[PDB]
Structures are given as structure tokens and as C-alpha cells.
Amino acid sequence: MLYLVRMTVNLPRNLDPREEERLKASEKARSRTLQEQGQWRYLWRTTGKYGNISVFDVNSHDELHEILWSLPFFPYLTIDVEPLSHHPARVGKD
Template sequence: MLFLVHTYLNRAAFNACPNKEEVYAGEIKRAREARAEGKTIGLFRRADCNGSIFIIDTPSHESLAEDLRTLPMFKYWDHVEVLPILPHPVFPDFATPRPLAEVASNQPLMPEKF
């Protein structure tokens, strides 16, 4: 099942975090695992720097909550919005995970600043 998730970063809280780099690296590691598991259908950033947006395919609300709660950045979110969405009848393929082969798994991580 697909969910559109908006996360809003509490920048002051994250900037006060002593091991910011480590937490963020953990977030990226988790994102790659989720992609490998076929959960991540889309992952984007807000151009206004207020947070991230991702489309996640997760079998149940339990797994959705677990996916959210186990993200290292979870503690630094001001709030999160979850919207249940559906594949569109015209292009059901958009709702399917993108074949991993297309993406070099060791994709160099573009620098990330908060």
C-alpha cells in the first residue's frame, strides 16, 4: 500500500544534536535498505529545505509506523503527515518499486547540509 509521507524537520533540535553526521548517515543507510526491500517508491526533498517527502509501499499500517519510528531522524521531526494514496488506473506502474539495477548501489552520497 502506498503512502505519501511529508516529514518536517525541527532544525533547531537537529542542529543541537551532538552526533548529527552519524544520525544522518544512519538515515541514509536505512533509506538504502528500504529501497532494497522494495519499500521506497519515491524519495524527494522539499526545495524550501523544510524536510523530505517519500512515497512508501508498505504492507500494513504496522509496518508503516515501524518504518517511520525506526528512522534515525524520527526524533528530530517536528511533525509528520501521512496520506494514503492509490496507484492511478492510467499508470499502475508508478506504484511499483524501480528495479535496483538502474541505480549504482554505491551511489556517491551528495553532501547533505542542514
């Protein structure tokens, strides 16, 4: 099942610069795994913005929740989740 997921990142200014670097690296490694495995299907950045606009391909809401909750950035994210359906006019794969 497909979901459109928007994430806005607000890392705190008083965040320790050294922890910030560890967080950033952990986040990148985690999104790599998830893209390689296919759950994180598309990953784009809205032009001019931090954060991402993505499509996830997972088999349940619970799975999507666990993936998002697991992200190192989660405590600093604002997330919007929108289910996507097959469009009858679609030519090719969803």
C-alpha cells in the first residue's frame, strides 16, 4: 500500500553540535536501509526546504508507524501521512 508522507525537520538550535552530527549520520544510514529494502520507495526534497516529501510502500499502517517512529529524526519531525489509492486512469504500475 502506498502513502504520501511529508516530513518537516526542526532540529533544536541548542542541540549539541556533536550529537547533531551523530543524529544526521544515523538518519542517513536508516533511510538508506529503508530505500534499499523498498519500504521507502521515493524520497524527494521540496525545493527551498529542509526535510522531505516521500512515498512509502508498506503492508500496513502499523508497519509505517513503526518505521517512522524508528527514525533518528522522529523527535524533531512534523509528519503528515496521506494514503494513496490506485487511480483508474493510471497507465502502468501504481
